[PDB]
């Protein structure tokens, strides 16, 4: 569900291309957040782990 593959739900469909600047998240750091970032790839199924890491690194 983290990839929001079921777009039949309205909540998964409310994310538009305008909702792009805030998906970056801590992009500047809330103006007070530091940037200690932990991408806890623990519970994610493995067959999309490489895909997720590639996504984040390329972004």
């Amino acid at each position: 569900e983290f990839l929001l593959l079921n777009q039949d739900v309205e909540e998964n469909s409310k994310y538009r291309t305008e909702h792009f600047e805030d998906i970056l998240k801590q992009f500047m750091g809330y103006l007070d957040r530091s940037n200690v970032s932990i991408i806890d790839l623990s519970g994610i199924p493995f067959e999309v782990l490489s895909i997720t890491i590639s996504l984040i690194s390329r972004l």
Binding site: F20, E21, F27, M28, L31
Partner: protein, 58 residues
């Protein structure tokens, strides 16, 4: 640092040669990490930068 070996037919002996510093130095700029840190808070503008991400004003 500052030494290279010239290998070729133009020389009898390929050797290490100490090259004097060129003057003026070309604009060799490599970003260094730490000094940018510890400089209070840096706040880039984002409207323009995501605008450039879309190949609008590149």
């Amino acid at each position: 640092a500052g030494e290279c070996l010239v290998v070729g037919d133009s020389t009898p002996i390929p050797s290490i040669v100490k090259l004097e510093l060129p003057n003026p130095e070309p604009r060799s700029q490599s970003i260094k990490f730490h000094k940018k840190w510890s400089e209070s808070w840096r706040t880039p503008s984002f409207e323009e930068v995501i605008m450039r991400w879309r190949k609008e004003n590149g």
